[PDB]
Amino acid sequence: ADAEKVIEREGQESFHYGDYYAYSKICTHIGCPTSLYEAQTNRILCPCHQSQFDALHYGKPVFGPAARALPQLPITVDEEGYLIAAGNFIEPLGPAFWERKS
């Protein structure tokens, strides 16, 4: 019911399997792991400085000091029926720095 009300980012509409979404675990504020995934509110909370990234909005932050959304990894299933990475991230991972932009 939740997968059907996801808003995709431009250029990554094909980065999900059936119901599976893979986001980088490293916070886009500072390199803390954002692993506090709330099952019902569908928000991912960072323990360090309390950024909430939406899971139904391609990882867009909705609270805290984080300004950039969480990078998403393409995934798919191979012939043997194991989950594999279909490609690579389309942006640098983790915290921002001076030279990081296009």
Binding site: I30, Q50, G64, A66, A67, P95, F97
Partner: protein, 534 residues
């Protein structure tokens, strides 16, 4: 045997007049003139427990499979640093005791300086000529905080590792040269080899040496100005009234010295700190909810939490939101360091002050201090607002907003209240000088008027109504027990009544004693007056 050791030690160092000068230095006796000693004693405990702690510690990041005292975590792949820190608490006899002593001493050290700095600030001991001391001390506290930070990051556990991840990612996200500077410090991407080595070699040498040098310079410079003191009876701006170094000051210093040492030895045993066996080896993927650094580092983390997402995108380049945090912390440090200069610009008074001043008589500075304390406390609370939120049942979003808004309205309310209370304390101080001590004897006059008996501290004119004594910068008595009108006049033990014969003489002797004391004190006052009119 003793006459001859001194004889052949003086015959070659000509030290009779040099030593006599040191042992005759007078030091003001006040409980707030000792808070600096606490920092010193805690520092001695740190460097002594620290040396013992380095005989068992290997600061290497090289991964090993653990087999040791801790039966859990056997078979777990950890760094060499973590394995040895885990060995000095489960395989070294009394090693946990010393480890905990070290950490407790670190905490006390930082709190021994903060409280000391507050004493210096409030009483105005940073004024001319004592600004080198203020600058030296400020550098001392910043370096103490930095030292503590790199100390608990040595074990390379999961909790401390996240602190290093935060610190590295703060550096890397600096405009222009934050990328090169990060790579110059860590020697590459985080984590790196020679990252626990540079930190270990700067925590047990670089910082200690710098700190020891600054401390020694600090103390020597203090011994040169021979302290400061509060206004009081017989004490002017060109003298020190207190006790000599021997036999009174030196013994009191040792007594208090070992008291602090003994207190740290109690907490080291009875109270757990930094239970690293429950935290596990550092792993970049694993994190915990309570990832606060340490109490003295909470303010920096609290600053990072309450800063909104304010990134500046400049085409091919980006300024992170955390940059503003750095800017803000930089401003706070600059404001703190260069305080004597800003205080004397807006007061226009630089007149070689040797007499202290009570906080109540400087409402602007006192209020600024309490304003800044509330700022620091709110940053500190915001730094651990996730443990506040759960344990005290408050919304975490609400806590963030309290921090954000509270940093503006908290300081404002603190200033207002503190200013008013300072003036209130000033007013209460004048009522006593004008009218006398308010005794609790509500007499009824024949007409029926209820009147309170007032005890004048000065001469009266015709019919009570004391001649108002001018303010003197000292503490005025407020109760009648402060003049010894409640003093117990029954010598003896708890059960022993004590013979009257020996009980009469002792009360007479003490009476003559305090009479002579008061006489000598008022004579000193008179001397100052007729000295100040020439």
């Amino acid at each position: 045997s003793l006459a001859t050791v001194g004889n052949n030690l003086d015959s070659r160092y000509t030290m009779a007049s040099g030593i006599r000068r040191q042992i005759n230095k007078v030091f003001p006796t006040h409980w707030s003139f000792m808070l600096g000693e606490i920092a010193l004693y805690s520092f001695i405990v740190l460097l002594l427990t620290g040396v013992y702690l380095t005989l068992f510690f290997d600061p290497s990041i090289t991964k090993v499979i653990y087999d040791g005292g801790y039966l859990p975590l056997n078979g777990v792949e950890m760094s060499r640093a973590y394995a040895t820190a885990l060995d000095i608490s489960f395989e070294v006899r009394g090693g946990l005791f010393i480890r905990q002593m070290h950490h407790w001493a670190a905490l006390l050290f930082v709190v021994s300086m903060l409280v000391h700095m507050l004493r210096i600030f409030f009483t105005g001991a940073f004024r001319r000529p004592r600004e080198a001391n203020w600058i030296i001390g400020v550098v001392l506290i910043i370096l103490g905080m930095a030292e503590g930070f790199m100390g608990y990051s040595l074990p390379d556990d999961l909790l401390s590792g996240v602190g290093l991840r935060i610190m590295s990612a703060i550096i890397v996200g600096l405009p222009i040269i934050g990328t090169w500077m990060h790579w110059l410090i860590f020697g590459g991407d985080f984590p790196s080899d020679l990252m626990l080595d540079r930190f270990y070699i700067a925590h047990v040498l670089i910082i200690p040496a710098i700190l020891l040098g600054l401390i020694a310079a600090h103390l020597a410079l203090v011994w040169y100005q021979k302290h400061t003191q509060f206004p009081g009876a017989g004490r002017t701006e060109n003298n020190v009234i207190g006790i000599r170094i021997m036999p009174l000051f030196a013994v009191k210093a040792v007594a208090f010295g070992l008291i602090v040492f003994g207190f740290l030895a109690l907490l080291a045993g009875v109270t757990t700190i930094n239970a690293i066996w429950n935290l596990g080896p550092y792993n970049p993927s694993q994190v915990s909810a309570g990832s606060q650094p340490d109490v003295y580092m909470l303010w920096t983390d609290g600053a990072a939490r309450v800063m909104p997402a304010w990134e500046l995108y400049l085409g091919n380049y980006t300024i992170p939101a955390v940059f503003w945090v750095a800017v803000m912390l930089g401003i706070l440090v600059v404001l703190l360091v260069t305080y004597p200069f800003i205080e004397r610009k807006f007061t226009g008074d630089d007149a070689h002050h040797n007499l202290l001043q009570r906080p109540r008589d400087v409402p602007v500075r006192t209020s600024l201090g309490v304003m800044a304390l509330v700022f620091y406390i709110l940053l500190t609370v915001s730094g651990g607002n996730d443990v506040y939120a759960m344990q005290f049942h408050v919304s975490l979003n609400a806590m963030t907003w309290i921090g954000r808004i509270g940093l503006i309205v908290g300081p404002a309310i603190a200033y207002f209240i503190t200013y008013r209370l300072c003036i209130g304390l000033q007013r209460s101080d004048r009522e006593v000088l004008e009218h006398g001590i308010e005794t609790g004897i509500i007499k009824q006059m024949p007409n029926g008027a209820f009147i309170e008996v007032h005890q004048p501290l000065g001469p009266v004119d015709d019919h009570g109504h004391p001649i108002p004594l001018p303010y003197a910068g000292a503490a005025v008595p407020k109760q009648m027990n402060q003049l010894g009108y409640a003093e117990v006049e029954t010598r003896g033990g708890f059960f022993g009544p004590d013979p009257e014969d020996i009980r009469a003489k002792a009360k007479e002797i003490e009476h003559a004693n305090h009479i002579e004391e008061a006489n000598t004190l008022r004579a000193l006052n008179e001397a100052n007056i007729e000295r100040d009119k020439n």
